[PDB]
Write a protein that binds this ligand. Structure first.
Ligand SMILES: CC(C)=CCNc1ncnc2[nH]cnc12
Ligand SMILES: CC(C)=CCNc1ncnc2[nH]cnc12
Ligand code: NA
Ligand code: NA
Ligand code: NA
Ligand code: NA
Ligand code: NA
Ligand code: NA
Ligand code: NA
Ligand code: NA
Ligand code: NA
Ligand code: NA
Ligand code: NA
Ligand code: NA
Lengths: 163, 163
């Protein structure tokens, strides 16, 4: 029958940050070039803007410390008002024998009266090909890394409010 | 005057393992292809031998989960009798604006009466060029990752003696 087939696999994780939405958002989205290497000094070597002004359509690049390469982030949505940010990664994303078309990363930070904010993180894996095999470890890996970056930045900013 | 100049920067870390030298060594060196992905399921996707039989001269490759590339390990010394292992990495190793010729990784596991063994880890950074600038974070990074792999494997093997 020869159908066109695609899988979109969504993983969602939340946690409560002590840092306010606005500060966490500014740290990652506006000051990432400075803060990513300060928050993860032994993993992220450099974060820079390759193309664009910071909004939708911007291409950023993270360079990792040591023999772990580098990756471009293709910015898709930037919503300061609602502390929402989305970007895609297109290269070097095959998960074992499962090719992918893209991985999409999205967060939305929601102010909460008790603490700082609720950090709502999503990763979406878009599959290439006619079938699908993704283990729990690989699906969890993307969302753990992504939320891990956010937690590192939160922790840094709480310890050094000077940024 | 035009001298030939090279830096060799050595970082050394030790800790006491509960697992015996022989088992930790076998796990990493002989059964790495199986154990590395079990010990670090969300970071190391695959560990395979590309060339050789496992001894000196063998080339192994680690593939990392997600957009973090892959790296070849060029095996230099394999000493089962003394639980010693050395390998080099040659590619993708520039540390910021400091090019490197190679990074060498070495461990020696020494049986200890109280616990299992003393894990003696070393990383050596060989610099390319006429001057040198390496921050504490980058020097610490290599040895933390390396010792981190060993600790992950130790922990896995203690929880699953079936390997
Ligand atoms: C599958 C997996 C472990 C993905 C992790 N990669 C990433 N996770 C979060 N943000 C990123 N930017 C570039 N690469 C990124
Ligand atoms: C500088 C740094 C963070 C190095 C870490 N890289 C590695 N550390 C330990 N073993 C390895 N095998 C291949 N690459 C390896
Ligand atoms: Na940190
Ligand atoms: Na690097
Ligand atoms: Na790259
Ligand atoms: Na990459
Ligand atoms: Na709040
Ligand atoms: Na398809
Ligand atoms: Na583990
Ligand atoms: Na990969
Ligand atoms: Na590679
Ligand atoms: Na690599
Ligand atoms: Na012992
Ligand atoms: Na030189």
């Amino acid at each position: 029958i020869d159908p066109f087939t695609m899988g979109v696999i969504t993983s969602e994780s939340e946690y409560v940050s002590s840092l306010s939405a606005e500060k966490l958002y500014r740290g990652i989205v506006e000051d990432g070039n400075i803060i990513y290497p300060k928050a993860l000094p032994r993993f992220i070597e450099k974060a820079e803007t390759l193309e664009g002004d910071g909004g939708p359509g911007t291409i950023k690049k993270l360079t990792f410390v040591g023999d772990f390469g580098s990756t471009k982030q293709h910015i898709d949505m930037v919503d300061r008002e609602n502390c929402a940010y989305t970007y895609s990664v297109y290269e070097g994303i095959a998960l074992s024998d499962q090719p992918l078309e893209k991985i999409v990363f999205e967060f939305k930070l929601v102010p909460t009266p008790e603490e700082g904010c609720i950090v709502k993180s999503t990763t979406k894996y878009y599959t290439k090909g006619d079938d699908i095999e993704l283990s729990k470890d690989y699906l969890e890996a993307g969302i753990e890394r992504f939320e891990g970056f956010t937690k590192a930045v939160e922790s840094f900013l709480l310890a050094n409010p000077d940024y």
